[PDB]
Write a protein that binds this ligand. Sequence first.
Ligand SMILES: COc1cc(C)cc2c(=O)cc[nH]c12
Length: 116
Amino acid sequence: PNKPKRQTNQLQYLLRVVLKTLWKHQFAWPFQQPVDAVKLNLPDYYKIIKTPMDMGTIKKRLENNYYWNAQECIQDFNTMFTNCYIYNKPGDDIVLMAEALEKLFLQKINELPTEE
Ligand SMILES: COc1cc(C)cc2c(=O)cc[nH]c12
């Protein structure tokens, strides 16, 4: 008894607060922009990494209403941190960074709205 909508307020939140909150983070630098796997010297990054994901690509999918619901934006956020876990063994600064961005991103989603 309900037609699916593009859940824009959670996605809004994920864009407005989360995205920007992450974006601005001490640890957001490799996520704001997409890693040049040549730049950080990552010969197997686009090899190992499932789908190298950045707050940029994510801010894209959010503000371009590509996301149908926040959880995809979240899973891209999770993806973002998980690629960092995928490549960099858990305990690497970038994972640790992602890990601090997780508790920050997930901070927001811990407070993620529900559509009226
Ligand atoms: C963009 O996030 C990163 C990914 C990888 C694979 C390595 C590093 C790194 O060696 C230092 C900072 N960030 C990294």
